[PDB]
Design a protein around this ligand. Structure first.
Ligand SMILES: NC(=O)c1ccc[n+]([C@@H]2O[C@H](COP(=O)([O-])OP(=O)(O)OC[C@H]3O[C@@H](n4cnc5c(N)ncnc54)[C@H](OP(=O)(O)O)[C@@H]3O)[C@@H](O)[C@H]2O)c1
Ligand SMILES: NC(=O)c1ccc[n+]([C@@H]2O[C@H](COP(=O)([O-])OP(=O)(O)OC[C@H]3O[C@@H](n4cnc5c(N)ncnc54)[C@H](OP(=O)(O)O)[C@@H]3O)[C@@H](O)[C@H]2O)c1
Ligand SMILES: NC(=O)c1ccc[n+]([C@@H]2O[C@H](COP(=O)([O-])OP(=O)(O)OC[C@H]3O[C@@H](n4cnc5c(N)ncnc54)[C@H](OP(=O)(O)O)[C@@H]3O)[C@@H](O)[C@H]2O)c1
Ligand SMILES: NC(=O)c1ccc[n+]([C@@H]2O[C@H](COP(=O)([O-])OP(=O)(O)OC[C@H]3O[C@@H](n4cnc5c(N)ncnc54)[C@H](OP(=O)(O)O)[C@@H]3O)[C@@H](O)[C@H]2O)c1
Ligand SMILES: CCCCCCc1cc(O)c(Oc2ccccc2)cc1F
Ligand SMILES: CCCCCCc1cc(O)c(Oc2ccccc2)cc1F
Ligand SMILES: CCCCCCc1cc(O)c(Oc2ccccc2)cc1F
Ligand SMILES: CCCCCCc1cc(O)c(Oc2ccccc2)cc1F
Ligand SMILES: N[C@@H](CCC(=O)O)C(=O)O
Ligand SMILES: N[C@@H](CCC(=O)O)C(=O)O
Ligand SMILES: N[C@@H](CCC(=O)O)C(=O)O
Lengths: 255, 255, 255, 255
């Protein structure tokens, strides 16, 4: 609902299509001060262009590669100095090598399996640890997952095992951080046409199947994830932790 | 989530401790016009008194015993004649005989088992059928469930089987009514002291074990249910249907 | 396994294609003594001719409509008098009105909803209660379910809610009867061509989708249900109760 | 379930209390030929002493540290030259640093998190890939898991997220290897006093809660896991893949 005098860190905007930019537009439109973290330079320039469409009167941008403890630790330390205590973190970060996102899961390399774990699951653990320091009176942390973490979805392969790892991460952090009044939840988004979606074998087939087979008979967009992000990030969800909310036209519920 | 020019029907207030009155207070605070339904004379009296705390310019109160098709059908028809189209329904209704909330589940009577299914599960299906008539543009329907529908909880017995039935009822309605743009969901509430809670053996023990074991280390209340009802019943949740949101301090996620 | 000296009651053989006759063949091959229950006189006729395929040296056949308490009570009592104590019960019984297995779930009548609960779920509870008397040292009870109890499968409709209720019944019975050393479990069978299948809309379409999509890329048969039954009814599974084993080519595991 | 003329590779015996020695006792009693893999020389020494209680007329022992692709690859290759084609693999391997099994999850180190994933989840993927070479006509692969993979259990911490990973690995392997007639399943064992259990904080208090709260009111042992292993590794479970069978006295089904 209304989020004036709230402050949220959004990680993982790459471009206009990022799920995280959908989150950002909804939080922005609701009055939140926003901070953004990015990995690569291109995502920075992009963010600077995208910020023109938002009502943020100023550009809070931090480079953080979640493969580096130092960058996560220092980035959050700096956010603390620049902006003060924050009210939550939206985590929208995942990665796996393309060669792993097709053909045969049983052929996945150790290096690729461990990389997807590092970036797509462990990153939440360390982000939660550092972000907690900026949440002395509690807060909310939301990560993004896909139904592939709950069932085996053809092609999603190593990323489905990373997402399953992430969803359990979310539950273990909810149990750990709960006494500190920090809630930790996931949004299981339906398929959405993003930069990262280009890397997944058979994406287009899945989008069509949703339209044919999901209860709502349509696909979801980034703003729909954003609205559910706003619920999860706000006092509207005050009793909810350890949860996975599927923003997916009801596909999760059918077989 | 501003709800002005929305109208919701709330089924199942008995007194100020009813979960559904937690829902009312929140929706009322957000500007919803509300319509209430009740079974017992005593519940209408309490409703009349409770309406003084709310901002409803008008008392809209209908007697509906969900054991009666004619009452549900004529109730919602009369609702549409008096207020027009509605945007959703909050179902907060269950019932079982007391001896069926303690002791050995295997001694449950047939009449007892069917009574709990009828009021606590079938009622949602018929309410959805009649309510659909007043939602030509779509809407949202939310029922109230307990974790005993997902796992065997000592003493919850016949009501656990009825809630497992209700939760599937929510999924099958979600699938059936999705093409009509009517979303159907459940809130799985943690234990709250209400009139119905006095019928369940070992209720106090469970309350204490939530405080000691759940991530948030505290129990939830009716208003926290209400806040997640407001998310579910508004456009904030637009891509979400067939879902069970646990408002239970994270207890569902641990073991 | 090895089942000489064991006695099992098998409920719900109607003809040679019944899931329960796949169970009977497997147990009979394993040396078990079998007792059979039936509702229609036609089912008894088929049973008498199917017994010719089996090494049962004695027909023990009992009419039990699980809608009648009297009949479940007297039947199990007579079984006890004729064969002595038993080791477990296979329950293969369900029923819904045909018109409820196609079209719109929201149009389900109260009478068809409760019929399905009564036959397909409540029946297990009273069977368990009566069978218990014949298992002073413990035993095993298995019921047959389908994935539509866990997810909303188009057309399965009222029977999905009755299976959700059955699967919770299994968990509550497991909890209640476990101290008596009676294990209670479910087999979630994949689609199999049976007399009851003839009543479900879109059944052939689902058979095809299983071949195309399930991990094993084929459908299962009654004998494969029987072999998992043998496991569950024997000491091989002594540690397992409240469980739902999917015998379905892995279809449950995928999306 | 006679297993004469079958061959199984059992990975992860360290001593008489290993879960995998439970499996081995059962498979060996059923007439299988068994091949064992180990990491520490001390484990080889215990295996030589334990083999004297088994009926195996020869010791087939191979050193395989699952952190090394070379040792997995050359290990299975050598196994195929010595005993020819096999019927299945029992995977009973996990590891985590002791500090990661008590205290706060959120303080987990990147290196400790990825170590646990590497040994406890990824190992199954590469083992399945190499073992597949020895199962041209199909076979069965079973891994060992814990309820901590499905819910946040206090103290299980980094291993819980490694088990979420493992259980998803099992589903993705099931889907991938299904067309080759290789089944992949998990057993979710209840707590058992083993060498690895000594490293987990609060293990004793959980053992006691199982006796008090689980449906069977008792803990399980390694032979019980072995019996379900024999079901999963044999033709009795032919229609069953991507499944997780809880051998835990029913504790998974209750809250
Ligand atoms: N699109 C879908 O259908 C879908 C569905 C369900 C869930 N999801 C999840 O939604 C989230 C966002 O993905 P998206 O679809 O929005 O695609 P996206 O726009 O490509 O976003 C991926 C983001 O992850 C960031 N990232 C990758 N590795 C990083 C690292 N090591 N450190 C910091 N940032 C890193 C990328 O940053 P750089 O480009 O700056 O490297 C990029 O901003 C992901 O968790 C994804 O798994 C997506
Ligand atoms: N309290 C909890 O810890 C808890 C936790 C999880 C879920 N729930 C669920 O929350 C919902 C509301 O219960 P509550 O705890 O708030 O208790 P409550 O205040 O006692 O409300 C239950 C309501 O059910 C209504 N009802 C029963 N049979 C009915 C019938 N045949 N026709 C119409 N209405 C009928 C009652 O109306 P009358 O008084 O007029 O008869 C009463 O208004 C139920 O679904 C319950 O299972 C409760
Ligand atoms: N076929 C499938 O694809 C499938 C998949 C998953 C689960 N299942 C389940 O498997 C079980 C057996 O069904 P099936 O497929 O084998 O079909 P089936 O051969 O038609 O068997 C159904 C049995 O239910 C019995 N029954 C129905 N109402 C009864 C009553 N009131 N009292 C006593 N018995 C009654 C019938 O007995 P009478 O004929 O004597 O009336 C019949 O023997 C059911 O629980 C079913 O839902 C089936
Ligand atoms: N005990 C329980 O209550 C319980 C419950 C559920 C699941 N589990 C699971 O059961 C499985 C067996 O554990 P357990 O309790 O039987 O304990 P255990 O006797 O200590 O066995 C664990 C085995 O893991 C092997 N291992 C560890 N790292 C390895 C590596 N890098 N390469 C090859 N082997 C490695 C160890 O071999 P070395 O000693 O030679 O290093 C040891 O043989 C594990 O997956 C565990 O998570 C245990
Ligand atoms: C067959 C699967 C069909 C739909 C997949 C839905 C889906 C889920 C994601 O988590 C995702 O983000 C990444 C995916 C891979 C690597 C990095 C990020 C993108 C994406 F489109
Ligand atoms: C061991 C039980 C642990 C706490 C149970 C939580 C709980 C759930 C309900 O669904 C409920 O409403 C009814 C219950 C029974 C009959 C009618 C309504 C009240 C209630 F307190
Ligand atoms: C669209 C779903 C297609 C797959 C259906 C699988 C299936 C499950 C049953 O439980 C069943 O027994 C019934 C007994 C009585 C009434 C209905 C069914 C028969 C049956 F084929
Ligand atoms: C919260 C306490 C709950 C009881 C834990 C049950 C349990 C599960 C295991 O997976 C395990 O094996 C490893 C555990 C850690 C590292 C390596 C192996 C041993 C173990 F006793
Ligand atoms: N006194 C009742 C209900 C209250 C309680 O259980 O604490 C019982 O023995 O079941
Ligand atoms: N082929 C389906 C379609 C039935 C229907 O039209 O409902 C059947 O009759 O089993
Ligand atoms: N091994 C101890 C751990 C004690 C501690 O971590 O302080 C236990 O069983 O709890």
């Amino acid at each position: 609902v209304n989020l004036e005098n709230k402050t949220y860190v959004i990680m993982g905007i790459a471009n206009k299509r990022s799920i995280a930019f959908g989150v950002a537009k909804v939080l922005d439109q609701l009055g939140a001060k926003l901070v953004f973290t990015y990995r690569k330079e291109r995502s920075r320039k992009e963010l600077e262009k995208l910020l023109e469409q938002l009502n943020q009167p100023e550009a809070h941008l931090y480079q953080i590669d979640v493969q580096s403890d130092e960058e996560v630790i220092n980035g959050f330390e700096q956010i603390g100095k620049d902006v003060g205590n924050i009210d939550g973190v939206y985590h929208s970060i995942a990665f796996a090598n393309m060669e792993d996102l097709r053909g045969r899961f049983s052929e996945t390399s150790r290096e690729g399996f461990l990389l997807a774990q590092d970036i797509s699951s462990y990153s939440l653990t360390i982000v939660a640890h550092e972000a907690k320091k900026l949440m002395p009176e509690g807060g909310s942390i939301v990560a993004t997952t896909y139904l592939g973490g709950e069932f085996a979805v053809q092609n999603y392969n190593v990323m489905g095992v990373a997402k399953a790892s992430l969803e359990a991460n979310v539950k273990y952090l909810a149990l750990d951080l709960g006494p500190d009044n920090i809630r930790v939840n996931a949004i299981s988004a339906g398929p959405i046409r993003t930069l990262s979606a280009k890397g997944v074998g058979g994406f287009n087939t899945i989008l069509k199947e949703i339209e044919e087979r999901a209860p709502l008979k349509r696909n979801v967009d980034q703003v729909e994830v954003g609205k559910t992000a706003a619920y999860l990030l706000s006092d509207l969800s005050s009793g909810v932790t350890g949860e996975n909310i599927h923003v997916d036209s009801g596909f999760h519920a059918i077989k």
